[PDB]
Amino acid sequence: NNWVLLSTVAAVVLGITTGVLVREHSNLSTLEKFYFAFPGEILMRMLKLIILPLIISSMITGVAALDSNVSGKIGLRAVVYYFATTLIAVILGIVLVVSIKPGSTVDAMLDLIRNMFPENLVQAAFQQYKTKREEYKIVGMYSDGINVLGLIVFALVFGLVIGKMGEKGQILVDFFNALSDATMKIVQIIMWYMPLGILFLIAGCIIEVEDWEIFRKLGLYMATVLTGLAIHSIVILPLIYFIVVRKNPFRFAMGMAQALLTALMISSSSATLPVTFRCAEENNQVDKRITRFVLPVGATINMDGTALYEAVAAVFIAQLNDLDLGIGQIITISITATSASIGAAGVPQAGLVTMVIVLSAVGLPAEDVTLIIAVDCLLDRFRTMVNVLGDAFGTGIVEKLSKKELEQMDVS
């Protein structure tokens, strides 16, 4: 049965009940609060532990399966959809902040290209490159943080090659096909522990708020993020779907309910990738070849909700700092917000870590993330649903336009 969905949903009810009662009936010290959420901490380690095999293997197997002739066209179609939606998300989010008003530019962009082509694959697996002007000469240093952007650019290129080599490379296709399935099943092992982790991730979140009035200060900013996420997922993404495929977008979104509802509870695109595969390929009867390529890449580079979030929050924090945001300066937020969402890993709190890239570029202190961290857990929950929904809709859109390529693939 679907006990996995019931168990994780029950964690939300128990997590909220536990967190509120614990927060009210006890006064946990800062150290005591940390130990309370330890079971949630372990789950995040388990989730972060699996994204590297998940991304590397799924990127290689998805691209490799596609034939050499049609791999480029399908890849081009997916990339155009990703940027088109992410840019529309950022534009929608930026228009909202200026309307609702809840409240080293080049070097940041170059560091993104310097990370698409890392100087070492092993180092890229756990370290990231950053450059800073100092005296002015640019000096770089490999700080910490998995380089998701670098690994994909390699896995995609590696996947394309081994697919083209043919029978000479069928062993690498077989090796990574099995390595992808082995990572699918390890994520299902994590699914069993997830209800325990969510019970404390949610409970721990609503215990560290301290003064409950910070939500009132963040109330309008809250609405701006949810309003943008609601507008994007309910209007824009369904609209783009209907325009291309000309089929009921809400029926397609209805099938992904397990993936969408799952994404909310756990708030991680990569962890729910196994759920997305089944829902798309089973409830919506989508081609396996398209799903196994569009989704894995989409789960990391295509994050429409996060891109809307980074732009909305960065501008919102700017209003708090009381610095004017005219036409000229808001552009770098749009470009950086799109870039930040590209590099963000498919894990919870990925938005918070990439906030430094957008916060620094616009000219804001790097510690302002603590101003909005109180509610980022609640916003994060919904961002993922939009992140998977955007990728989920991409599978249907890309499949429809790639109909000719798929037709000539069934006949080898």
Least distance from C-beta 207 to Na ion, angstroms?
Answer: 28
Going from the C-alpha of 262 to that of each of 61, 180, 327, the distances in angstroms are 24, 21, 39
Going from the C-alpha of 391 to that of each of 48, 157, 173, 301, the distances in angstroms are 20, 21, 24, 10
240, containing H or E segment: helix 237-245
Provide the mask over 169-208, with x wherever binding to Hg ion is found by CB under 5 A and - wherever it is not: ---------------------------------x--x---
- Ligand-binding annotation for 341, yes or no, is yes
> Which residues from 201-260 bind Hg ion, rule CB under 5 A?
202, 205
Residue closer to Hg ion, measured from CB, 124 or 202: 202
Query: Residue 389 binds which entry of Hg ion, Na ion, none, with Cβ cut-offs from 5 to 8 Å by kind?
Result: none
- Ligand-binding annotation for 227, yes or no, is no
> 170: burial class by Cβ within 10 Å (0-12, 13-18, 19+)?
middle
Query: Residue 387 binds which entry of Na ion, Hg ion, none, with Cβ cut-offs from 5 to 8 Å by kind?
Result: Na ion
Least distance from C-beta 82 to Na ion, angstroms?
Answer: 4
Record the tokens describing residue 392, joined without a space: 């989920």
Residues forming contacts to Na ion in the complex (CB under 5 A) are 82, 85-86, 269, 298-300, 302-304, 344, 387, 391
118, containing H or E segment: none
Residue closer to Hg ion, measured from CB, 11 or 78: 11
Other Cβ atoms within 10 Å of 10 Cβ, number: 15
Give the C-alpha separation, 7 to 60, whole Å: 33
Record the tokens describing residue 225, joined without a space: 């993020």
- Ligand-binding annotation for 85, yes or no, is yes
Other Cβ atoms within 10 Å of 210 Cβ, number: 11
The helix/strand/coil state of 325 is coil
Least distance from C-beta 104 to Hg ion, angstroms?
Answer: 32
- Ligand-binding annotation for 67, yes or no, is no
N residues, the chain: 412
Least distance from C-beta 8 to Hg ion, angstroms?
Answer: 14
- Ligand-binding annotation for 82, yes or no, is yes
- Ligand-binding annotation for 383, yes or no, is yes
Give the C-alpha separation, 404 to 400, whole Å: 9
Query: Residue 287 binds which entry of Na ion, Hg ion, none, with Cβ cut-offs from 5 to 8 Å by kind?
Result: none
Q: Which of 377, 385, 388, 389 binds Hg ion (CB under 5 A)?
A: 377
Record the tokens describing residue 104, joined without a space: 């080293």
Contacts of 227 (CB under 8 A, 6+ apart): 96, 100
- Ligand-binding annotation for 305, yes or no, is no
- Ligand-binding annotation for 224, yes or no, is no
Residue ranges for the known binding site for Na(+) are 82, 85-86, 298, 300, 302, 304, 341-342, 344, 387, 391
Binding site residue list: 82, 85-86, 267, 269, 298, 300, 302, 304, 306, 341-342, 344, 347, 383-384, 387, 391
Residues of this chain that interact with Hg ion (CB under 5 A) are 202, 205, 377
**Known binding positions for L-aspartate:** 267, 269, 306, 347, 383-384, 387
